[PDB]
Design a protein around this ligand. Structure first.
Ligand code: NA
Ligand code: NA
Ligand code: NA
Ligand code: NA
Lengths: 242, 243, 242, 243
């Protein structure tokens, strides 16, 4: 019986989150940059509404929220999900492209939260932000993605402290989620022994929305990878110089 | 049967609710607890709930408990390490032996029960859930013993996860203020979520984690947002008073 | 003997960092938005050069780096410091103003690092980012500041992983630093029993620049405040409903 | 005299270098260490350096050590808790008593020495520095005992800081790979900072922290960036090999 808005809803983790809310009995409105896949996803699913647009554009965010209000009539849950990867300093990623990554991954979650503020407060709703374990550890050439994801982890506790007790706000930080065959080493290198699936994330989204004593938190869902201490030559790991 | 579940501190509070939740889920549960009367009462006329009276501080008792559990459950799928005992610390000049006792119940017992159950949990592709506290990460004065045990169990969690993966997944929940026994308007309002926690908040998370297969090594804070609230005297409704 | 560039150098923490590097024997070029105070700071200090401009503007960042290269002839250390506070969601801080806070506090550190990349690599230099304990805990209405500071903490490890081993990159997260009389309660509430000073931060900046086995790290310098567990009615703390 | 400094594990490695650094700073240093020969040699013909032979695992020994230190130093200004002993864990089925012994040296000793020195440190407005490990925060397999002790000492750090502030400030350093005894090209390149750590990297941080007055309760990672490197098999030069 909830109205749920989801960003990045036409594929991967976002798609599975939309499906899981539909299955829970909710109505879902999602925004996504790819019209074809998104229209198809929504087709012949009467409680699933698609809005085509780029979350990088603030005016689009306002029109998206207006559209969702027209279709859902109420907003109980906002899920901020933005998958776009990027390069960084080793690629000399230009200022404008770094900024764009921030627009999609950090400005949009703020602005959608701001647009939906009163409605979520009134409905005693929930905000769920999807980050990444890249907020906390880095591979080389990841500056833009790292910056957006670190920012959304902090934004999560900021929003939680602003909007509590009426709105609870939490973050999930996925590791490697298959959104598209893997080698034996690919799977065995992860402590949990498998690659993640969008359902591992969506199960956590739905669970967190039903809790009432968790707010401000970021939960890591990465099969234990970030907790594995790795030194060259020890416990099956090796570094190669090119 | 479904799962065989062992729980420490099962006769009261959080441990009691975790036991009940696993029973409702269809499992068989064996718990250890230091208080015979309350625990025997809890298990009475509940055929899938078995009580073992003992102190987890004693390693011989831990071995006897696991043996008892295997007799009653015939399999062990989930181990829940829960130890509530609070203590004092350096301002109270808490003695060495008393500090050690808190470590025995809060840190040694979870390790030893994991070790005793190792092969069984691996065989059954089971789960270990450790209950810590937000006191692992921030402190009030005179909390050294509790802090040390809880910080230890948070680290033990990722150690066990790295040792026992992929067959056993191991995670930790760090509760804040959970009501285990009337609160003022300020009591509830001071917590960002605006309520005091309940044992169901924790047990719900235990049962959920046991069903996940891509979370291991993690500690999840369940404290109504309290640890995330920045607090400075005189700002945003908080004030410090000098005695 | 180092060339050091510092942002926000005309006041507060930035000012003290500039002074400490001058005292260490270095040449320092700083950017700052307030011409009068900054020109005065640089006056009759021949190894201290001031560049007036807004770090929010990428073209200004390029001209600043060009100016510093002309005056210093080499860049060994980059210190990213941006003090500007802001409101947040409870004030309904507009998208553009949230973005501006990100420009100064997150885009600028990236872009200056990018502009200085080759020079810092060549000189085996150091980047020091100044964040805040607000990256990790929040008061209400802090979304913009939280987002920028969380982003810079993550940017720190991203840059460290990209630029190691040649450039080491670390972050300091100050708590309450006096940059402008306090009550007995003000001071006693902080576990260390005092309010911080810009020298507490600058001492850490200079120390970190001399280390060679610390990279990617954020060090909290807040007198222990973030580590104090606080519940209403316990250990001398009290919450008041208005 | 200047400061009176007590250091555990002072006869070798990191502890040895910390002792030397305090001596060079003009202080008097008393250390305890389990190896009599190497420690007596270290103290020989260094009048401001005093050695006490003993096992920090023994609480009676800890009390005797502090008494000895007060006799030789006449004041205690700085306590440095350092304990290097590695151990095995659950995959080795490390027994209860051996797990406990690691806790005794790594977690109980720092608490008890802080307690024994409490009034003296408060009077002198002193410092406690705890040496942990990045193994408090991430794990390799079979590390349960070391992880538990190091996680415990990181939490103990903020507990002591909250108890003893504002008079005593208390901080922790978490070293990564420190050479305490020839490395391959891959050994050094795998670390983001491109070198193996040295005991001076740690001692420099100890002496620096003792001089700060607005840092307390904190753990600083000194590991060349290793814990911050995200590593996935097959990407960015790292590979996992199945036995
Ligand atoms: Na539809
Ligand atoms: Na029964
Ligand atoms: Na000048
Ligand atoms: Na001597």
């Amino acid at each position: 019986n909830r109205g749920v808005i989801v960003t990045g809803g036409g594929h991967g983790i976002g798609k599975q989150i939309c499906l899981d809310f539909l299955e829970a009995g909710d109505k879902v409105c999602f925004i996504d940059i790819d019209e074809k896949r998104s229209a198809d996803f929504a087709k012949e699913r009467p409680n699933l509404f698609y809005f085509h647009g780029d979350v990088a554009d603030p005016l689009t965010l306002k029109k998206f929220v207006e559209y969702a209000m027209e279709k859902l009539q109420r907003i109980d849950v906002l899920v901020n999900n933005a998958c776009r990867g990027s390069k960084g300093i080793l690629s000399s990623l230009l200022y404008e492209e770094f900024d764009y990554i921030l627009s999609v991954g950090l400005k949009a979650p703020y602005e959608l939260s701001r647009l939906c503020r009163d409605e979520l407060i009134k409905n005693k709703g929930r905000i769920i932000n999807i980050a990444s374990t890249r907020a906390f550890q880095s591979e080389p050439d990841s500056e833009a993605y790292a910056s957006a994801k670190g920012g959304i982890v902090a934004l999560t506790h900021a929003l939680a402290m602003s909007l509590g007790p009426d709105v609870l706000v939490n973050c999930i930080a996925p590791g490697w989620i298959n959104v598209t065959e893997f080698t034996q080493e690919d799977c065995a290198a992860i402590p949990a022994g498998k690659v993640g699936t969008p359902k591992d994330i969506s199960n956590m989204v739905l669970f967190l929305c039903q809790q009432d004593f968790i707010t401000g938190e970021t939960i890591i869902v990465d099969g234990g990878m970030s907790k594995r201490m790795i030194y060259h030559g020890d416990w099956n790991w090796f570094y190669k110089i090119d």
